[PDB]
Each structure stands twice: as structure tokens, then as C-alpha cells.
Amino acid sequence: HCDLPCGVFDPAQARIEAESVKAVQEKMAGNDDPHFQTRATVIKEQRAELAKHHVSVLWSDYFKPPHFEKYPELHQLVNDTLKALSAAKGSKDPATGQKALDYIAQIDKIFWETKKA
Amino acid sequence: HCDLPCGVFDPAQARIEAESVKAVQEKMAGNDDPHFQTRATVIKEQRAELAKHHVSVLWSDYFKPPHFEKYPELHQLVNDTLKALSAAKGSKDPATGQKALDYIAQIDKIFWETKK
Amino acid sequence: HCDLPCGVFDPAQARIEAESVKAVQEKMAGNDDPHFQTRATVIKEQRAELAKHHVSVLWSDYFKPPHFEKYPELHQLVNDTLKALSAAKGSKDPATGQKALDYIAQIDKIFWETKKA
Amino acid sequence: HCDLPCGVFDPAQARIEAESVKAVQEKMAGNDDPHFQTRATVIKEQRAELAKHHVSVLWSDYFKPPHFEKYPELHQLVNDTLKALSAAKGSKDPATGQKALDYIAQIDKIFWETKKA
Amino acid sequence: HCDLPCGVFDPAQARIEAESVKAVQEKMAGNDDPHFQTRATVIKEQRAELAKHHVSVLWSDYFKPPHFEKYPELHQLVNDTLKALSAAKGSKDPATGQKALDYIAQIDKIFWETKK
Amino acid sequence: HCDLPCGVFDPAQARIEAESVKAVQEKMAGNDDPHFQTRATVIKEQRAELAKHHVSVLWSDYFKPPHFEKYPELHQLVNDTLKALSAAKGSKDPATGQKALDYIAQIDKIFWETKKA
Numbered sequence A, C, D, F: 001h002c003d004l005p006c007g008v009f010d011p012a013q014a015r016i017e018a019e020s021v022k023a024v025q026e027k028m029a030g031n032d033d034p035h036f037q038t039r040a041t042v043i044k045e046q047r048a049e050l051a052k053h054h055v056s057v058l059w060s061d062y063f064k065p066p067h068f069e070k071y072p073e074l075h076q077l078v079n080d081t082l083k084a085l086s087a088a089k090g091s092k093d094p095a096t097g098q099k100a101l102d103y104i105a106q107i108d109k110i111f112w113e114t115k116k117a
Numbered sequence B, E: 001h002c003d004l005p006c007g008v009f010d011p012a013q014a015r016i017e018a019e020s021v022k023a024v025q026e027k028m029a030g031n032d033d034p035h036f037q038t039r040a041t042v043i044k045e046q047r048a049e050l051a052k053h054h055v056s057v058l059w060s061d062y063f064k065p066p067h068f069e070k071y072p073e074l075h076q077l078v079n080d081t082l083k084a085l086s087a088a089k090g091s092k093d094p095a096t097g098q099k100a101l102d103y104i105a106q107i108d109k110i111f112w113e114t115k116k
């Protein structure tokens, strides 16, 4: 995940940040205080950016030609995942955070299949 | 974990980073090229620091006074965990990586108990 | 402070960042411009976060088991200081920035004693 | 490039970092001092990582479905560019930096065609 | 620009970041949604800070005493440029973004003269 | 120091980071372990870089045109300090860390005068 390569990767890193994104979006419906809303927006932006970075590192550093060969939809899925995270940044609606998580979940299934044997 | 509070924590964040530290240590044992050794040292330093931040965060942002009362040894455990990580930082021996992982696993145990 | 170890520590690093937090809280009371309010919120989150990092570093990298023996309340003190910094992140009230300073002043008092003996 | 979106992007950001990567690799053949070699390796790693981040941001934030439609090789080219930057990180040979630059150059031509009308 | 020295500099790094500042200012004028305004404010602050770092770097790491002698006004220009960027940070008016861009263009002019 | 402006500045931030630089240079003379030498090199690059940021910040965000009028050599002084910090990044010799400190001490002297009048 660090590009040594160390060969340690886990889509859980991207998932956990994306789970924070959604958690924040949900908290934003419960407290209309301007200061709270602003801190939530600041922190959402950061966690969504870290999520994007973890997704991108998987795609660049972990996934290799035989994976792209076996999963020809994987390039586009990764791109759709990043754009869903951007749409989450730009939105207070938890449905957008959830969409990002659903995409990451497709990445995680593919990841673990490639880790098998 | 982002201090909103957002309420999402998982010691897996510390864990995966400390696993990377150990993995890098293991690889340093295999290949003595100076350039590689240096890159491994750079990376190990980053990963260990990240792991420390995650551990420090659980301690300050997740754990609360009722937990420190029920687990009177938790402050020292977290301190020892951070010191273990500093020691893995300073070392190429994967056993130091593993010691940090062992301490993290003690924290994870407590963490999931408090989730019940 | 850099974990080499280099042996250069000073709670002044935590203190100056916590002073910035309090000073930003004080400025927010003087200008209701929503853009200023938002920038102040961005800056206060960052500074408070750096203050927490400096405080954690002292506890993990400077203080050692004999210090914890001699000051059995140091563990809880450091935890309280970080929670006070998080409470100031979440607030516009300078009294919260002050409270974080109060705790930092207690750590600073212990620190300099350990530099004597 | 910041994901507002601000709509300001330029592959020159990724190019300039990748030009530093190569410059460092070339400087590494001229001075065998261990300390110099170490600082060069440290700085190479950083600039290659920033290059990767600029390439990834183009792919995720600037490029859109009609671009991927018109350039069906663009996903793979971006992936090859990132791996070339990783191979540059892992290498003292300026030919690896140059390969990363040749890839970025293909991205830059495509970028500017999509910016036309 | 990375302090090796690597010898690669281009005021385009400051420029593109300051162009992003101005672009964000322009967009703030178009859409008064609070969430959007906040995100624009977050981003503008980051981009402006990055631009400052690039400018400060040219000044310390690229420019040398012979340049400061040939261009006695360069120290003040760079200082003014950083202050312009701080002012764009504090403002939603794209004219402040443009002022910072104008100062950067003065630096770029001098920079390319010294490359000849 | 955070560009709000918040009005909290102290050259002690630059000073403590430059002390770390010098202290790391001194440690490198005491332990020839190649792994230690490399970590010391990593840490010294980072600390020196933070010191340069703190020095630049004072010059850009704290000092103002009347200060530059009263101290016409302040511009060159700040430039010299940053070049001295870069020279210490590039060196193992503590004399270079010391020189960076010497310059910082001169800025600190001017700073506190401007806090009086």
C-alpha cells in the first residue's frame, strides 16, 4: 500500500474512510448549527479524499495486468468509485456516501478473489 | 476517527499500517541493495507514524472515562503500544513489528469488548 | 520529537498551536462574515489537530516509565488535554481554548521538572 | 484539480514532478556520497508520489465518460503511467524517469485534444 | 524545487494553484448554497497555501545572490506576492485571485530572464 | 501563523525544528549503523523543511511593510536563513545546523523588538 512494494493491501482502508463520509452526512441531518455544519463539511472533504487515495493506490499498486485481463470492467469500476466519492464530497445526502460504499464493496470482492490461490 | 465526532473507529487502521511495517522489515532481510534498504527505511518510517496516529486517536477520541475505569491498564497499554511502534521504526527486525502488532491486538480485544 | 530519537522536546509547540485555537475562537466573536466564520473554522480544526499531535508526541516519545511512576496522574492528564483540544475543535467559545491551555500548562510544569532530575 | 470542481487542470503538474524524478536519478550517477545518495532516494520517492497523485486526479476528476468513450485506451494508459512512476521510485536509472515522462506526454496530448472545442 | 538540489523549477506551479484560487472565487459568485460555499472556502484555502509554498520555494531555492543584485526589487516582489495570496485566501473576489496572478507573472518574467 | 490572520506568532517554532536538525547531525556522528544513518537523514530532511516553512511564514504573514522600512536587511536575512536551512538539510555537519540557528536568533531578536513598538 506504500509502494515499496510491501505487498500489504486491504480495501478496508478505503471502506473505513467512506464509512466516515456517510456517518458525517447522516450527522448533518441532525444538527443545523452553522459551526457544526461547517466542521462536518471540512471533515467530510478530508475523509472522502483519503478514501479516494486508498482506492487509487489499490488500482495502481496492487492490481496488475492479469487482473485487468480477468476483470475487464475493473478500470471503469475504479473510475466510477472515485467519481462516487467525489459526488459524496459534494453532497450532504447519505445516499451518496452509501453509493461510494457499494462501489468499494464491488472492489473488495474482486480484491479477495485475486488474493485466493 | 476524524474528531467530528463521526463515531466510526476500527483498530484495523492501526493494524494494517503495523502489518506494513512488519512486511517491510521482512523484505529488508531479503535484499541488501542500498537504494532498496533506503526506500524500505523511508516507507517503514511513514507507516509506523501512521500507525501511531491511529493508536493515539483510539485512545483520545474513542475511549472514554468509563472505559479507563473498567480497564485501568489501558493508558499504559496504549503508551506501550506507541513505544513498541517507535521501536519498530528504529529496527529492521520483524519481531519488533510483531511486538507492535501484539500490543495492537491487546487494544483491539478491549475495543471490541466495549462495542458489546 | 521526531522519533529518531533526537532528544529535542518542548511543550511550547503544543502551547503555541492551542493559543492559535483560542485566538481564532476570539476572532469569530468579532466578525460575523460567513466566509470569515468558515475560514476561522477551517484553521481552528487544523491548529487543534497539530496541538493534539504535539501533546501525544510528548506522552509517547518524551515521557518514560520512571516519569509515569513519579507522576501517576500523567496518563489521565494527557488524555484529558487531548479531549479538551477536541472539545475546543468543536466549539466557538474561547473558554474551551483556555481549558486546553490550562491542561497544557500542567503538562509543561511536569515536563520542566523532569528536565531537572 | 482540487475537486470542487474548480475545473482547472493541467498535466504540467504531473510532468514537472516527473521531471524532478529524472533529474534526481541523473544526479545520483554523479555523486556517490552515502548521505547524498540517501537524500536523493528520499526526495525521489516524494516527487514520484506527488506525480502519481496528479496523474490519478486527472483520471478521476478531469476525464469523464465521453473521454473514455473516445479514447478506449485511456484507462490503461493512466494505469501504465502510474506503474511507470512506481518503477521510477524503485530505480536509480534515468531511463525509468524518462519512460514515466513519455507516458505523461501521451496523457497531455489527449488532455489538450479534449480541451479543444 | 525539492531541495536536493534537483535544479527543476517552474513558476507554473505557483501559477496553476493561483489560477485554481481565482477559478474557485469565480464559482463562489455563482452559487450561494452554504455547503458549496464551505467546500469552496476549504479548497481555496488549500490551493492558496500551496501557491505560497511554491512562491516561497522559488525565492529561497532557485533565486541566488546574483539575481537579488540584478533585481533589487525581487525580495519585495516575492513578499508582496505572498501577501497577495493571503489576501486572495481571505476573499471571495476573483480580482484578488487576479492580483496574486499578476504578481506571480512579474516573478515568472524575472524567472525566465534568469534562464537566458 | 495560520493566515486567518490569528495574530499568534513565535520564532520558537522555527527554532525548535532547527535545534532538531542540529541534534540529528550530532547523533549521526555517534552511530554508524547504516539504518540509523538513513533514518537520521529522513528525519533531518523533514524537520529542516518544517523550519523553512516557519521562517517563511514569519516573513510573509507576520512581518509588515513598516517592519521592512525599519529593518531594511530583514528581507535578505530571511532569505539567508532559508538558504542556511537548505545547507543543513544537505549536510551531516552540526556546524551547518548551528549556522541556521544563528540566523534564526537574529530574526528572533528583530521579532521581539516589533512586539514592543
Ligand SMILES: [Cl-]
Pocket: A001, A002, A003, A004, A005, A006, A007, A008, A061
Ligand atoms: Cl506496495
Ligand SMILES: [Cl-]
Pocket: B001, B002, B003, B004, B005, B006, B007, B008, B061
Ligand atoms: Cl470521532
Ligand SMILES: [Cl-]
Pocket: C001, C002, C003, C004, C005, C006, C007, C008, C061
Ligand atoms: Cl525523539
Ligand SMILES: [Cl-]
Pocket: D001, D002, D003, D004, D005, D006, D007, D008, D061
Ligand atoms: Cl476539479
Ligand SMILES: [Cl-]
Pocket: E001, E002, E003, E004, E005, E006, E007, E008, E061
Ligand atoms: Cl532544488
Ligand SMILES: [Cl-]
Pocket: F001, F002, F003, F004, F005, F006, F007, F008, F061
Ligand atoms: Cl496569521
Ligand code: NI
Pocket: A001, A002, A003, A004, A005, A006, A007, A008, B020
Ligand atoms: Ni505498501
Ligand code: NI
Pocket: A020, B001, B002, B003, B004, B005, B006, B007, B008
Ligand atoms: Ni471520525
Ligand code: NI
Pocket: C001, C002, C003, C004, C005, C006, C007, C008, F020
Ligand atoms: Ni525529535
Ligand code: NI
Pocket: D001, D002, D003, D004, D005, D006, D007, D008, E020
Ligand atoms: Ni480543482
Ligand code: NI
Pocket: D020, E001, E002, E003, E004, E005, E006, E007, E008
Ligand atoms: Ni527540486
Ligand code: NI
Pocket: C020, F001, F002, F003, F004, F005, F006, F007, F008
Ligand atoms: Ni495563525
